[model samples]
Target: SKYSQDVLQLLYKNKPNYISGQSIAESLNISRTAVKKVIDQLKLEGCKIDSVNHKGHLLQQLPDIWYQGIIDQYTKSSALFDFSEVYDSIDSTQLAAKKSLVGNQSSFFILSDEQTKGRGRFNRHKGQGLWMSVVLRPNVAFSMISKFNLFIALGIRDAIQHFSQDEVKVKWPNDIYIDNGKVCGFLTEMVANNDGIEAIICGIGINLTQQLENFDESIRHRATSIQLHDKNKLDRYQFLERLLQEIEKRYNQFLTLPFSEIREEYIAASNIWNRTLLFTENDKQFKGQAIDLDYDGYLIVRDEAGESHRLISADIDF
Candidate 1:
């Protein structure tokens, strides 16, 4: 039950210090026996708790517990939150989301503490990152799906900006760059069978508290985390809460507004215009300078031959 998480939160607040059973019951307005039951359940879940007859209970270690109350507090204003789900561990939020949307079609999301097999090639283990998929089921048009990646990226960029002064940049298509290192990315997947758009799962992963040594040696220098840049440690639950609201806000804009409304703002944040870049189209490599984003929000690159090309996707060599 959610009371387990509530009880865990109380223990977390008084870490290494004994908190009386009566105190916990009074704080949560539950019976002392109920608190004891929850404490036993927590022990079964691998949490280490110590108790003394006269004193109280002390949590020896804090587990990677999801604080639903915090997320609820921030997302209660939005009806979109009614459909959210959180998992302790999963193969992939995107993969799990596919199953979640099979019998259900309303807009919802799947968030996981750790992804055993994440779509992105990164370290997504527990206690150090945010792995989530915002499954958006919109029936506007299939052609508009290409622009969804940009809109989602912009929302995440803005969300990060809200928490830190670090300059966050959206790399073309779907990645966030900060301090010249990749910090966040999205794996936007669409499910359709010609009838209409079934679902759009914008799988998002952000590096949160990992240290330099935690990263793989190969890409260590090119990878970074939010804690590395921000002096104040960010609360994971609080950030996830804000992210849901931010993503919802952008989703509304995407549904009701035109790409022209956010085109310039996206360009300003990305700063890809006039930058020299290399990309391959149809197996042919080409060097070009980014010019502008078309009305549909695709990158328009002017090749060396002065031929203008609108890129649907690219592995940009910057």
Candidate 2:
């Protein structure tokens, strides 16, 4: 099992290419026959590997490692998160945290390699990116969840700004942007019992190292990555550590302070504000100018008919 994941990592790091069986055998100091066996196991795990008669093998892509390097760096941070990492997982980290909460596991972190089913806001499937979920057991009411989304978005935006030359902004209902392109997505799911709000799991997906070829042709034109925008590759381990630190700081600030105090900073970084865009919700589309975002993170738009509407969620095409 260990060798299978290791081989997959090698393939993932060198995607859209073939690494000969002999090369794998020589590199890992294992026998060619053993390498073949591992390859077969990887195939069973849904990886596509092509074997060439003389050339050896080609790996179509890399299996998500959820690399230990990332975990190690974050563990060194003096933050609030209780971090955990897994080699393989079947569901989203948010769902895992939800289940853990029911069992009395209050606050922690869940990072999975190969989330069999990852999701974003509105339950949209997001199969890639640095998929992570943080469970916050805040003594707050359910009414404050929207404010939490704004807080988390601000934290992520601040983290991204540290690593990028471009400015990062928040698109309403919880998406992070650089210019007009989406760079990060957030999903917050809360649970409540008779006592109070049990746990709020804030899930985030950041396109740090994904390739353009990884996306569908239709979405590829709109999807972008840190490598694409930065013109250099980033070490995922380093980025995650920085992100966790930023989130921890802002999250603590949110708990200790009031939402009104931090809402202005979030508004300043919102990309859709003051921009003309199309807002589509519930199969209806309206053209409007995004004048401002309300205190509760709703998009304030003046539609073409001179009617102002407060939109909770919509695709912003500026």
Candidate 3:
């Protein structure tokens, strides 16, 4: 019930201090046994709680808790929040969002602790990635869909800049990079016919804390995590809250303002902005100096022959 959640907030807020169970019960108007029950439930949900016999409970680490109460706190006092579902393990957060697309659901956040069948852009493993999908029921013109790539990329870039000291950059088509390794990518799926667009599902997969030794040898140096670059134990819930809040603020601005307003911001975050980039498309490799991003968010690359190419999707390389 809310009582347990209330208890958890007290504990989380005073995480540095260890409060007594009797004191908690006295202040919360619940029995000490009930406090123990709440602690036990939190334990079952995977929070790293500790006790010293009579010291009560201490939240040394926020565990991978996916309770409704916790997810609901994000909804409370939130205007853009529509729904949320957090799971211990799932095949894919994107797949979960796809399955729950029957209703008029919009602005929903779906996440998983570990994705057993987590998907990647080219059939890669997402063992310890921050797997999440946000569904927006925006029925705008299908042509405008490409802009969300920049929108979400900038949102993540903004949030990461606040937390990581590493030089963060955006790879075109919504991939976040740190130094020479890939840190994040976005795979968007939209449900619509020729008459414009309807549902848009934006899937974000970020390397959070996967051990480098565990990565496949061939791809080890090609990927990194927030913890790896920043050297901090990123609590899943804490990071999610920060990410969701940033995305929410950026998304609202995206819907109202011109894409050009935020275009410079996204372009600046990508080290490829004015650098030469290479891509293989249709069995042909092309190299160009990325000069600008169009108002609609397409990559405008000026090739060696002085010809400009507007690219929407490609296997980009540097």
Q: Estimate each model's TM-score.
A: 0.78, 0.72, 0.81
lDDT of 1 by residue, 190-247 (tens): 8886677888888898987554444444566667776566666566665776787789
* Winner of 2 and 3 under lDDT: 3
The lDDT per prediction is 0.76, 0.71, 0.75
Model 2, C-alpha of 279: deviation from truth (Å)? 2.6
Question: What is the clash count for each candidate, in the order shown?
Answer: 0, 2, 0
Using lDDT as the measure, name the better of candidate 1 and candidate 3.
1
Which should have the higher TM-score, number 2 or number 3?
Answer: 3
Q: Which residue pairs in model 3 clash with each other? A: none
Candidate 3, residue 222: lDDT: 66
- Please give me the total number of clashing residue pairs in predicted model 2: 2
Q: Can you write out model 2's per-residue Cα lDDT over 136-232, one digit (the tens) per residue? A: 8888888777777778788888887777777777776678777656788888888976566778888888887654444334555556565455645
User: Candidate 1: which pairs clash?
Assistant: none
Candidate 1: give its CA RMSD in angstroms: 5.1
